[PDB]
């Protein structure tokens, strides 16, 4: 052989720069990143960064060559091109002054579907449920958003619809194990086909949207997770449960627009799923309902709200320092009791949960050696000193918790 050129072989055809990926695809950076979001493609780290370049030490991100080289032939890229053609051919109609032909161009418009993009991403159903962890976190955030000029109302209404479908199913087949109310929101854990998904729901207050965040990146994630959730929910309902999609009662959606609405027709294993059976809870006005009625209906209780007005009831959930009525028939609880009954599973006594007293701390469900240092190498001294510092920074923080507990317990 002739002397081969140096920096064109091993790591140079294994990886490519962002610029080289964009150029090779002949696609805009935005659309390159849109496809990258849909396909689940990410930058990868080579063992040599400069052999992955053509010699240069430079701030560079490396994609996998065969990954981009596999993205090139794909229906979604072709449909992006078709959207670009449609865009100019519409503004041709609009810019001239003809409205009827433009309106007709809307009628003769097909759009890209993210159907086949999931088959190649999550080939098995249990793999899709391993992703639904991050998928349900976007979607439940986007339900609790005011619609802006960035994000249309149709987007939020469809996202909220999927959210309500998810909440309805989990409360239907009784698949909750753990709850955790934090400052951030309310965490749930759910054995969905026996693999424990986790997801977060914010509190139902108006959310201050920063102008800092980019509502074009988040919209494509929503666009992928949305379709992914449609296919997941069809699979779940048509396997073990119900018809999809279920209908919604109009005068129920006028009252709550939550979870007691949206009725679903068809044609246990865990202690949590057997709890609250033959119990009827009267949720008061003061507590948030949609974060709580999900849990009651999931375990096996029943809900009658103060809100619905605007019997069999055995417990009332009230958050006031002064409670007015006080009947002999009901038992009076601050919601912390429910948030502990789900976590333990053993029905915690309501003696520490009376209206007017302070709640329990609410835990999450989640010499010679200095002399024998010497005979270690530098490649072992560096590592051992690092492990010593990592244990020290833990133990001193544990000492901080103990010292703070002692300083508070005195007061």
């Amino acid at each position: 052989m002739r002397i081969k050129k140096k920096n064109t072989r091993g790591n140079a055809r294994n990886f490519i720069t962002r610029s080289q990926a964009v150029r090779k695809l002949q696609v805009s950076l935005a659309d390159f990143r849109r496809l990258c979001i849909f396909k689940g493609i990410y930058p990868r780290e080579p063992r040599n960064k400069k052999k992955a370049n053509k010699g240069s030490t430079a701030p560079t991100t490396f994609y996998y060559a065969k990954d981009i080289q596999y993205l090139m032939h794909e229906p979604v890229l072709a449909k992006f091109r078709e959207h670009k053609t449609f865009a100019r051919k519409l503004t041709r109609a609009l810019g001239r002054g003809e409205v009827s032909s433009a309106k007709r161009l809307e009628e003769n418009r097909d759009s890209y579907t993210l159907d086949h993009i999931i088959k190649e991403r999550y080939p098995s159903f249990p793999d899709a449920i391993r992703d639904i962890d991050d998928a349900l976190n976007m979607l439940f955030l986007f339900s609790n958003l005011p619609s802006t000029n960035q994000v249309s109302s149709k987007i939020i209404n469809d996202a909220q619809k999927i959210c309500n479908q998810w909440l309805a199913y989990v409360a239907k087949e009784r698949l909750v194990r753990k709850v955790f109310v934090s400052i951030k929101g309310v965490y749930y854990q759910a054995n969905i086909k026996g693999e424990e998904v986790r997801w977060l729901v914010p509190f139902k207050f108006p959310e201050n949207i920063p102008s800092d965040v980019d509502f074009r990146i988040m919209l494509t994630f929503l666009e992928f997770y949305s379709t992914l959730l449609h296919f997941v929910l069809y699979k779940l309902y048509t396997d073990s449960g119900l018809i999809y999609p279920p209908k919604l009662d109009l005068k129920k959606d006028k009252i709550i627009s939550g979870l007691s609405s949206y009725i679903l027709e068809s044609r246990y294993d865990s202690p949590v799923a057997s709890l609250f059976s033959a119990f009827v809870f009267y949720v008061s006005r003061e507590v948030p309902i949609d974060i709580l009625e999900f849990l009651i209906l999931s375990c096996g209780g029943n809900v009658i709200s103060e809100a619905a007005m605007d019997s069999k009831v055995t417990h009332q959930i009230v958050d006031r320092p002064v409670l007015k009525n006080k009947v002999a028939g009901r038992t009076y609880i601050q919601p912390q009791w429910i948030f502990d009954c789900i976590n333990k599973g053993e029905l915690v006594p309501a003696n520490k949960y009376l209206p007017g007293e302070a709640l329990p701390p609410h835990l999450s469900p989640w010499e010679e050696k200095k002399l024998k240092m010497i005979m270690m190498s530098n490649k072992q001294k560096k590592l051992y000193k690092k492990m010593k510092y990592s244990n020290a920074k833990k133990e001193e923080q544990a000492e901080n918790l103990k010292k703070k507990k002692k300083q508070i317990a005195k007061q």
């Binding site: 519409l90 309106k103 802006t148 000029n149 108006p206 959310e207 201050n208 709550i256 627009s257 605007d310």
Partner: protein, 161 residues
């Protein structure tokens, strides 16, 4: 009338009770406003999605209008009237009570987003479609015996939320 209802700004809502005194003033502003009796979900979703409170900032600044994030803010500003939380505000707004005139001027106005919300390719055509839908779903009577046009607010706020 639009100063009293504090609706100088476009794309802006407010709650009022309609009586025999309120109805004559409604005929004057009818070409400027679109009215209707909302439902419990329209009210409840509107307050938990949008809400302003004009009160003091850090130490000096007064004109901050922020957000209905908390319930302890509700306590500090209302409190003794019987109102403790945001859901209690929803109660006195949906059901006509004593504290309605208290909390109505507490959420001053709402800030509804405009329809379509753009000038471009898709947005101009969608504004054209909606602009011709306006004159069909709303008429200007102009006569002294103008019948007050009431529309579905459940459908309209499905568009504006």
């Amino acid at each position: 009338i639009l100063s009293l209802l504090r609706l100088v700004e476009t794309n802006t809502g407010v709650f009022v009770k309609l009586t025999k005194n309120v109805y004559p003033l409604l005929k004057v502003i009818a070409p400027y406003v679109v009215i209707g009796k909302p439902s419990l979900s329209s009210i409840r979703s509107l307050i938990q999605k949008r809400g302003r409170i004009i009160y003091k900032g850090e130490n000096e600044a007064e004109p901050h209008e922020i957000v209905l994030n908390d319930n302890n803010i509700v306590e500090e500003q209302l409190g003794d009237h019987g109102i403790i939380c945001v859901e209690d505000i929803i109660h006195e707004i949906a059901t006509m009570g004593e504290s309605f005139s208290v909390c109505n001027f507490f959420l001053q106005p709402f800030k509804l987003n405009r329809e379509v919300s753009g000038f471009g390719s898709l947005n101009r055509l969608r504004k054209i479609k909606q602009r011709e839908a306006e004159s069909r779903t709303r008429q200007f009577s102009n006569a002294a015996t103008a019948p007050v046009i009431e529309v579905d607010i459940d459908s309209l706020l499905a568009k504006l939320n």
